[PDB]
Amino acid sequence: SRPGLPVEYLQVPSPSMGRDIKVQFQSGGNNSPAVYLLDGLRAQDDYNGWDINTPAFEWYYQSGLSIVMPVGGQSSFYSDWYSPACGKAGCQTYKWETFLTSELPQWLSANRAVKPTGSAAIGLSMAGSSAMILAAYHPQQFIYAGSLSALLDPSQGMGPSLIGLAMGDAGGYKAADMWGPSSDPAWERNDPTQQIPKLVANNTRLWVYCGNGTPNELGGANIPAEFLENFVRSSNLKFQDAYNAAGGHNAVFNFPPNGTHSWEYWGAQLNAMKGDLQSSLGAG
Structure with missing residues (x-):
């Protein structure tokens, strides 16, 4: 149903x-994978864009999988920032890697019986690279990563620069506050793309x-949707080449002759991936 599902609006301390x-949540059942x-670059502080734009909770009710939607973090790239995330409206602390890889799974396990390991991370836009990085450095926790329309080589060439422009445009943040000047490791x-060997080794x-x-x-x-998507597609095709060349073998590459940087296309992917998630994470 859209109304009538056991969807919660959690306040999870960080x-x-x-x-x-805030965390929008729908349990899978006890001990269910997560x-x-x-969310995308312009993540709002009230509801996650997945909830807003798709019937995600509805598609995933009774799939055996817990759906976890963190709320907030516009321009954070779901990363731990070097410095305060100062933007138009003010400053906030961004330590999203820490929260997603320790604070939240522990609270979800203690308070909702969500299995803390063996999870998938799926992001779009800024969050597609985040998802792969979560998996790259935290493979026990994230055994699956979905990336929808992301820039997959953000450290190379004009990427540090483009990322800074995006962050300016979405909230008025500074990339330097996040990862420092582009020279920073x-x-x-x-x-x-630089973390491919980790993805490959962990058989993510x-x-x-x-x-x-x-x-x-x-x-x-x-x-804008058209230009954006065409733009990020080369990094995606290179990723695929590099992955295969490094011996990658557990990926689905979906690069159709259509689609723009819009939720109609992203929602379609999330709907299409449900059986793959269930098999890969062990739903039922």
Whole structure:
């Protein structure tokens, strides 16, 4: 149903960020695997864009999988920032890696019986690289990573620069506060293409999607959505080449001759990945 599902709005304390993080949540059942649905660049502080734009909880009710949607973190790249995340409206502490890899799984396990290991992380936009990085450095916790329309080589060439422009545009943040100047090692640490050997070694299940910038009847036919998607697609095709070349063998590569940087396309992916998640995480 859309109304009528056991969807919760959790207030999860984050010691490292100094506030309570809101978390939209739907249990899978006790000891169910978790699917963390990470939000895009312009993540709002009230509801996660997955909830807003898709019937995600509805699609995943009774699938055997807990759906976890952290709320907030516009421009955070779900990372632990070097410095305070200061933007238009003010400053906040961004320690999202810490929260997603210790604070939240521990609270979800203690308070909701969500299995803390063997999870998937799925993100779109800024969060697609985040998902792969979560898995790269925390493979016990994240055994599956989905990346929808992300820039997968953010440390290379014009990427540090483009990322800074995006962050400016979404909230008025500064990339330097996050990962420092582009010379800082944090750039390569958080670049999924540079972390391929870790993904490969950990045999992480990858679901990698990117459209080609051509909308279809599904919609999303606006210039920004089209330009954005076409733009991030080269990093995606290179990732695929590098992954295979490094001996990668547990990924789905979805690069259709359509799709724009829009929720019509992303929602479709999340719907299409449900049986793959169930098999890979052990739902039922």
